[PDB]
Design an enzyme around this catalytic site. Sequence first.
Site, PDB file in Angstrom:
ATOM      1  N   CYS D  21       1.224  -1.022  -0.483  1.00  0.00           N
ATOM      2  CA  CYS D  21       0.110  -0.449  -0.089  1.00  0.00           C
ATOM      3  C   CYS D  21       1.057   1.756  -0.288  1.00  0.00           C
ATOM      4  CB  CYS D  21      -1.038  -0.129   1.281  1.00  0.00           C
ATOM      5  SG  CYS D  21      -0.054  -0.541   2.362  1.00  0.00           S
ATOM      6  N   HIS D 338      -3.008   1.277   6.511  1.00  0.00           N
ATOM      7  CA  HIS D 338      -3.382   0.891   5.586  1.00  0.00           C
ATOM      8  C   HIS D 338      -3.647   2.470   4.895  1.00  0.00           C
ATOM      9  CE1 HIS D 338      -5.465  -0.330   1.687  1.00  0.00           C
ATOM     10  NE2 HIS D 338      -6.377   0.536   1.981  1.00  0.00           N
TER      11      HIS D 338
END
Lengths: 76, 75, 621, 406
Positions: D21, D338
């Site tokens: 990510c 995230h």
Amino acid sequence: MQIFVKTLTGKTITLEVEPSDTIENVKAKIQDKEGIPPDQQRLIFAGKQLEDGRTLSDYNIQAESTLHLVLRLRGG
Amino acid sequence: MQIFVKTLTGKTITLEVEPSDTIENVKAKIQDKEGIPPDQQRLIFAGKQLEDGRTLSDYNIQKESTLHLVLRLRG
Amino acid sequence: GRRKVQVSYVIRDEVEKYNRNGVNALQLDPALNRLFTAGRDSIIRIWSVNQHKQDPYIASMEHHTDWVNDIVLCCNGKTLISASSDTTVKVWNAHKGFCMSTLRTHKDYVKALAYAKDKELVASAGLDRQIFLWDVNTLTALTASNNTVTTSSLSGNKDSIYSLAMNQLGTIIVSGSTEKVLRVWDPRTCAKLMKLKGHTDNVKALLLNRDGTQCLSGSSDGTIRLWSLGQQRCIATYRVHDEGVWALQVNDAFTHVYSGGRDRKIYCTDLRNPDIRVLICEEKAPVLKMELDRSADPPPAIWVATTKSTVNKWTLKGIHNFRASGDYDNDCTNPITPLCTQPDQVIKGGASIIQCHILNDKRHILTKDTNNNVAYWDVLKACKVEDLGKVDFEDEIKKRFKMVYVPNWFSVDLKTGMLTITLDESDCFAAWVSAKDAGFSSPDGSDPKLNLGGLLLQALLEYWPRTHVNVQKGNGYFQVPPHTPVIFGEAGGRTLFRLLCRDSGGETESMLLNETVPQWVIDITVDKNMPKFNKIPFYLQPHASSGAKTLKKDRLSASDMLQVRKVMEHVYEKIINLDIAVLAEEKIELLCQDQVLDPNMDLRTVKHFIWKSGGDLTLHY
Amino acid sequence: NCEKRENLLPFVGLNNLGNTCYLNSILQVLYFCPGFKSGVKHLFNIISRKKEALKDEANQKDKGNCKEDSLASYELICSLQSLIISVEQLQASFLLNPEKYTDELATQPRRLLNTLRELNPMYEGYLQHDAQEVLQCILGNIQETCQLLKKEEVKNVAINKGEEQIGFELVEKLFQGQLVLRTRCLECESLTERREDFQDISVPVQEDELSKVEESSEISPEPKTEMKTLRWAISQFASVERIVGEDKYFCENCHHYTEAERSLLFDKMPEVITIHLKCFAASGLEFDCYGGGLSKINTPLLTPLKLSLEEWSTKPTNDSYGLFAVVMHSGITISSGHYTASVKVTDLNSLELDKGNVQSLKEYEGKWLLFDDSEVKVTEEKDFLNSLSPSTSPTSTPYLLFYKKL
Ligand SMILES: [Zn+2]
């Protein structure tokens, strides 16, 4: 890495693993943290059933991924 | 030789070093002066990170040089 | 619980007659016509201003271990109170020339002092954002039985204080700091009175009149502000200086102000109308503090302290003559003629050490003074060897280049214009040197390994009674001169004690030494426990050009004092063999990175000079 | 099956390799930097010409030392340009007709990940990493390649001709700028300054655990209360800092540890200002020295859409800046989370390929996006700014802010 383990009852279980870890190791950790035997665990990701001889990266399993864990009962 | 380091809060601190000390020594001194463990922290000088193991001379670091200090936001 | 205690000592002569650095403050006692210099070299010197005297020196009283930021002469010129940057304010005795009681209440560089003659009240502000009012009558009464004084304090400051002033009546005290705001208390009740705003930078000079209803502020932005405390507002601004203003003086009538700062010039400004101003003199350095001659009105002369070591008195005669000249130069293109060209009186000063270099043997220092003269000191022996004079410093460094290495075991700081050695527990005993290399030869030819830091600290306290082993004293190798100061000051903070070497032989210094010195000094000085031995790991592999097959990589370990000669003798005896030294020299060659290594050049020298890598040292035969 | 109505934006995400990510976000912001694509294209053209010339002259030349350090530096640009080409080709294919991409539209950046992991060994495996660090590695390697190419072309050599000089200093002309490390002693008032380059502004973020007033009653309590904006944080970075107490400047002019006023000044400004928020914190205490008191400041700052460093610039800066991309950490700690990029697709007029080798995409002009790994969703300006404010979102804390000079 965090992966959300979802069963047919709507329960979400968080498991911390690594993509290099095999599916068998993931099932063993799930059994350790939940009591569900690895044989009864059926893991589905994007319509694909995980194989204990493979790893998370082999099936391309991401972080915070909802995997449909299906409980398989022997007898009935 | 005296160098400055911009801490996390933005305030500068001063360190007494020599041109022949590795970045590990500098990080240990910053740990002593702030409490951040050496492995967690990162040092940036002149827009470039100070790779561990390298000394201070090869970064042409002189007196009155500032090393910005940041942590590791993993994700 | 307790901070890091660093042992320091200074190499200096018995008497430092002249100033060896800038002078921070001056005080004049018109009763005796004496002059006190608060030099940046941490020494207070008493002069005799009487011009017909050939030698203006009288005596000195040295107790500070850092800059002397400000002094005030109190009790009709009987007691001197000095604020120093060693986080102490002391109580001298001007007539006698010694210190009575030291106050360590401040926790940073004390930068100012204020005197209230009527009440004998002295305040001491510093860099720790604290103000501590004191009473000289209580201070001068301090004894061994009564050595605790309630620390009358003022609250409100949030920035390090650089100046302080109290009116003569002792009813108003004003502090100037980097906050750029003058906070005013009422010293009788300590209540905050008001805060004065308007200065855009640090304020370093503060003056107050007799009744305390007016104040004069000297700020680092180059402006002078006259504060009327009744209305809590300024009433006039004097932009007379180009660069900053760090010193202010005013006569008894509070009418003319003599300012002096960074631009090395001093002016006289009429407080009523600042249109007229006379340039007193142009000094050779920035002016730090002044002290008017208050034996007559108008003042006859003004004493000036600069960043240089020379103290100059400038004559004020003819100021009325200069003002009556009518030279109203409305055009700034005409430079104002200085009233004085040369100082009327000169107090001679010395030269300050401005550049230092320690040779690779880590025992000698080459120091370059402000006269561009270079010197040759000896840290271990604490004595100057040769004053080489005006010779180029770098060429003298390369002339005295050594091919040996000794680990760092101290630091040199020239804050006091002289050479001071600081010893820290972390690295003081990192240096080990062979007896022959150190220059001391035993009668039997034996060469013991002596720790230079420990050998120095043993001699620094040779007169200490606990160190007399049953009579053996000190270390038995050399003797640091008795007049050498010894300082036990905490790291980056206060100073716990200062004494000369010969002072330990007494009683009170002996009683204070055991408490002041830390334990790791007692580890070697008294316990005689030999410090840790550093060790070296290294690799021995056959050379490619030798032709022998590659042998197992044996990671042998030894000490840094092991000569390469011993290693090569062992290799010759145990590798190729399987009087001796000469044959090994003529037959066996040891190479690091494929270059011949000097048999008398040691292993840590190899690490520092030849290997030049972060990995383990590798030796090839 | 119609929860999202099978709606896919023309803009291309990137299928993360499991825990990439951070890298994917960095690649997505880098893709939209003004001139970065053209710069990398020019570098690829130069690299390809040099490679083909070396291949042609390899037979004639003897003792060819083809060091693998230069080979890897060349390979990084190779992989970057290959990824850019693949992404743009898939974008064009989806734009022409999207029926074949009913699912998510993304390209796997396997080549660039492999290049980084062989270039930097600490990217091995599939762990989690700082996005800032990845950006630093990529920019540093690109600058190294650019300076090597410049040195090689200078050695070979020894209306407007600036086209060939556009790419040789890409990192220098895009991300790196100049600072003045001005220090003023307070005992002698002598100004000694240094001149250090910079590429990112390490801006502090402060939690209310320091600078606590002892009494707040006898002393003056506080000047004012204000929500910490980005201007305050930049001023904290680059305004007068009185170094007092445990740390004091050693002034060689007076040979003493004297108080000093340090002020950093922005002399030369890069075309893209990177502001690296210090959302992490030491929490003041070390938590009884339990391996350091690591913490994250979930409460963001009031970051504005415009910036002007005139307040901390030597010369009068008449050119302002505008936010175009932000990298957000959507976790509760620093060890995991995230990463999500959020870029503003704009500059379509100058969004063109390098010359050395608009209305169609104007539908999203001046609109933010939320590149959640392979999943892409458009977020409007106002709600994005609202989520940026500390009152709304304590999870998606911004980490990196990129401003482009206008
Ligand atoms: Zn200075």
